[PDB]
Design a protein around this ligand. Structure first.
Ligand code: DHE
Ligand code: DHE
Ligand code: HEC
Ligand code: HEC
Ligand SMILES: [O-]
Lengths: 537, 537
């Protein structure tokens, strides 16, 4: 067996390259720069630097540019998305020098996270046997609102009708979203630290029954929703490591782990860090629809047989991020934000229906579906790069002329928008502008009359209605209640500042309530149980 | 868009590790060790060194062992497969010191190989329109033998009946195998350097019509064989980079490239170098059956829609390598050699039928199928770790009691065996023993009487019948002709030595012919067109 595997490797030694020629930096210096890199740069440039949103920062490129090009670029930034760390005064000349030296070295390697680590992190707090057989409290679970108290690493269940915080549960740091099990009993939350918590809404007092950590960093979680699979499996995508994990939908036991490392859809070259973004459960087949960002692939992971996984890798467009179902729940309208496109994934026929060109940096969230008087059923989205609102036709059967076309546009307060919203019972369309550099715009939301779309929008002074005092008071993500007569908004203020949840009477557009509480720290995402569980948007 | 991707990464800086603490070595020293590493170590330890047959040689482990342990281990080796580079005198004390220092550094990175590189390497020598419409020569193409003249980087087409070299074609270095297109017109060969050459057997004189390089290092190639896909696609697996590529089966144009990097079947942890081994074309579905070694996965890559690839990842056992069809052409009998198992892949129902325990380091090649008088249809394989020959039952329908069981065993001349062989028309069973340390055994093949399996085998002095003179004269891979009355053997002698192809009258077991030629340099693999094309084994 020794002489058999004894012939030379076909790989040419000359072409295998050693890495160096980097400026010398001590342990203290290298760590200070490493800490800055993850607190300030990692989000956009990635953990490895092959590059996300912007150009790669690998040694081959950085050393080519040299110390000074790097110091200067980091110092003033660029008009294409790269913040000015020097001019703004964010970082010192000394620090920027350190970062320029740092990016000239081989990127340090973060740990991997396989089954051993997963199982070690897996915990069953309350076994399925020991869990109640019926609802042991008199809460109106369907109208409950799971609110993320970001910096607190908790979530608060707010009663829809009473406007009170019914329970505060400790979770992973800065939970990114909440999702509901198909049965409507379990609430699944995932922190950016990849920590998932499963919460039983039937317990006397809603409590965590299981937990697990599926990676170092993550964003999405979902539950199986195909007929005959209620609470069967639970999936979660991770940023690092580039992977997603399928787990038991009852105990959260890790079953399968799949690497999303691979070839890009555009250049068809290898990308060592294709982060997993949105994940939505199919209703057409027993599959999960996974978005793989950097490679721009939409994976149809079939869980009919989890031991021998079948995945259909559909090419879309680079930088897939968020998105949601069309009115019929068959077409996944997802946004390839830095490509300025919205990919239409047919979950039934399992193929890319079309690539719709939209405004700069679309950010639909899960989007807004409504029937246009002239264009029929459409799905809409606002943007981060401009104040447009794209309306895309979603009816190939009865409206072929408008299917997959940016049929019309609306104009909002400006760019920096994050979430557009509406409801089957509502006649209004809201658009927030959370990251708009103007304080007044970023603290208010635009509202359109669906019954008269030619009319300009109305501006609701959300943050002002909260009456909180100092702070940026950024408003974010409109969200209806089960009956669709009220729309909730989060007044995302600092951790040491005061925050609130503003409710609006959708019928009159008048302030209805304001939820304040010392525990309501940095409220961001809000997810009404029913509307979330049944994809009502 | 800047403040939105402006929050800190969930990844803890403290856990992202810088790599070093390695012994200082100059550029000349590092390259001398790098050159040795790929000429002598890479085959077993892998390119990135995360371990294959050989153990992990990554810095975390090597530095823990320290300079001394390393020098000593490399010097004397171990009884578990690690050759003794010092004791044998293969490497000097000076070199071993260099290697011990080298493995303590971060492994240098070999280049990737995506579509840009592939297309650049793609060449259409003769367009499909310019190619003949019928066979323009009088050769008996079905009985042609594609022989690999390993060190010459060529292959020789030998006429079966005349025993003469009809044509010598330049190819990639050390072609590993030959495969035939379903039509039986095109001959596909692939070098270990990943260079594939497509050869038209209908041209006045067989000539290359297209070529391409699918990686830095590779071993397998295959053609689509499902009804209605003759010559449609052509796949090829690569060692580095860990990937396989689907190409147009007419012009060899690159269409799809898939990364095999991923999670292992056993530990379910990430493996950065899962090399692709055997690839066999399905007859049950429009799929290719790909073996992924280190992760032990068998991929069913469906090409019905190559733009939206669907892959069924089946778990098997680590270290999948070679294997072949059962008599019926439904079950892929593959060998997970370092696991001492043979995986049975059901190509129809698309599932792992069973994991059969066999001898030490099974190496079937494509195996040998024959009907046992007592046990019914069976598939057999010899080994590299011992002299056994495992007979596994392959008839679940009419012989359930013997299906997937190591029903019986035969004993050969000893270990170091590579290929067992037989034919529907033949009543003999041959096994070679190419890497047996004994010269006499390694230069001869064992033959069994299928009509009397209790009888010991007969030893055929192949190399002696060649009458070549000096040299190790290792005999390798028995191979029948279309009619199944002759069995060919390659007398794999040195490049500066003399080699030959020995033919045997299968009916009498008597020397029939001997093919010698100054051009027949280091003949290894031989592939009869018909028997290869129609998986007759
Ligand atoms: C991939 C992804 C989804 C889709 C999940 C799904 O549907 O399966 C999503 C959804 C969301 C949703 C879902 C809302 C919905 O209605 O579906 C919310 C509330 C939200 C709050 C925020 N997200 Fe989100 N978000 C990211 C990723 C994602 N966010 C980022 O990587 C990014 C750009 C940078 C970061 O630092 O995380 C980012 C910034 C933010 C914020 O700044 C927000 C406002 C506050 C926070 O906690 O960081 N993200
Ligand atoms: C994965 C794989 C296959 C199956 C491909 C398929 O069916 O599509 C195969 C087949 C093969 C076959 C196919 C025979 C058949 O009838 O199917 C032959 C002749 C062959 C000649 C050799 N192989 Fe092979 N071989 C490797 C890999 C493989 N060999 C190695 O990695 C290894 C262990 C080490 C190496 O250096 O490549 C190795 C050593 C050898 C040899 O030493 C041989 C005898 C000479 C050589 O050229 O290197 N291998
Ligand atoms: C997104 C919110 C960013 C953050 C945070 C950081 N960078 Fe960035 N960077 C980003 C983009 C979109 C671009 C492209 C700019 C362009 O117009 O091309 C860049 C580019 C760089 C570069 C230069 C790359 C090159 O041209 O070779 C460097 C050196 C760079 N960015 C460094 C860097 C550092 C050190 C940061 C954190 C302290 C940082 N960037 C944050 C987007 C974003
Ligand atoms: C296969 C034919 C091998 C070749 C060629 C080389 N090595 Fe190897 N190595 C191999 C195996 C199977 C093992 C396991 C041995 C055991 O009994 O555990 C090893 C191990 C080593 C080690 C020790 C690692 C450890 O346990 O800490 C070292 C340092 C090592 N091998 C080095 C090495 C070098 C430098 C080689 C080429 C010059 C080399 N090996 C070739 C198998 C094979
Ligand atoms: O987001």
């Amino acid at each position: 067996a020794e002489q058999y595997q004894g012939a030379a490797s076909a790989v040419d030694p000359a072409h295998v390259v050693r890495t160096n020629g980097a400026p010398d930096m001590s342990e203290s210096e290298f760590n200070e720069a490493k800490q800055i890199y993850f607190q300030r740069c990692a989000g956009c440039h990635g953990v490895l630097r092959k590059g996300a949103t912007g150009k790669p920062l690998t040694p081959d490129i950085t050393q080519q540019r040299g110390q000074q090009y790097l110091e200067a670029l980091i110092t003033y930034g660029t008009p294409l998305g790269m913040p000015n760390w020097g001019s703004s005064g964010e970082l010192s000349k000394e620090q920027i020098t350190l970062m320029a030296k740092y990016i000239q070295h081989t990127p340090p390697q973060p740990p991997e996270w396989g089954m051993p680590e997963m199982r070690e992190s897996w915990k069953v707090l309350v076994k399925p046997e020991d869990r109640p057989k019926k609802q042991l409290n008199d809460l109106d679970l369907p109208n409950l609102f799971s609110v993320t108290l970001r910096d607190a690493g908790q979530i608060a269940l707010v009663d829809g009708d009473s406007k009170k915080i019914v329970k505060v549960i400790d979770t992973g740091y800065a939970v990114h979203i909440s999702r509901m099990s198909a049965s409507g009993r379990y609430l699944l939350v995932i922190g950016r630290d990849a920590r998932i918590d499963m919460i039983d809404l039937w317990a006397k007092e809603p409590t965590k029954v299981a937990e697990i950590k599926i990676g170092i960093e993550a964003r999405s979680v979902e539950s199986s929703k195909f007929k005959g699979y209620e609470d069967r499996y639970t999936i979660a995508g991770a940023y690092w490591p580039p992977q997603f994990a399928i787990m038991d939908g009852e105990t959260l036991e890790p079953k399968q782990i799949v690497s999303t490392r691979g070839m890009t859809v555009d250049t068809q070259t290898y990308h060592p860090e294709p982060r997993v973004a949105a994940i939505i459960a199919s209703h057409e087949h027993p599959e999960f629809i996974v978005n793989v960002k950097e490679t721009g692939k939409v994976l149809l992971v079939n869980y009919k047989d989890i031991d021998n996984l079948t995945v259909t890798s559909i090419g879309a467009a680079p930088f897939l991020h968020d998105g949601g179902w069309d009115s019929s729940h068959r077409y996944f309208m997802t946004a390839a934000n830095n490509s300025n496109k919205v990919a239409v994934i047919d979950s039934k026929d399992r193929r890319l229906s079309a690539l719709v060109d939209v405004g700069k940096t679309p950010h639909p969230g899960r989007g807004a579906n409504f029937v246009h008087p002239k264009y029929g059923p459409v799905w809409s989205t606002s943007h981060l790069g401009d104040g447009s609102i794209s309306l895309i036709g979603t009816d190939p059967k009865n409206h072929p002329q408008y299917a997959w076309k940016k049929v019309a546009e609306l104009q909002g307060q400006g760019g920096g928008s994050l979430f557009i919203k509406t409801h089957p019972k509502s006649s209004h369309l809201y658009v927030d502008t959370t990251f708009n550099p103007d304080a007044r715009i970023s603290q208010s939301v635009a509202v359109f009359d669906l019954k008269n779309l030619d009319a300009k929008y109305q501006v609701l002074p959300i943050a002002e209605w909260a009456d909180l005092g100092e702070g940026a008071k950024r408003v974010v993500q409109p969200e209806y209640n089960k009956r669709g007569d009220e729309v909730w908004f989060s007044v995302w203020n600092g951790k040491n500042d005061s925050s609130a949840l503003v409710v609006v009477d959708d019928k009159t557009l008048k302030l209805k309530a304001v939820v304040k509480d010392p525990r309501l720290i940095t409220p961001t995402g809000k997810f009404n149980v029913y509307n979330t569980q049944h994809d009502v948007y």
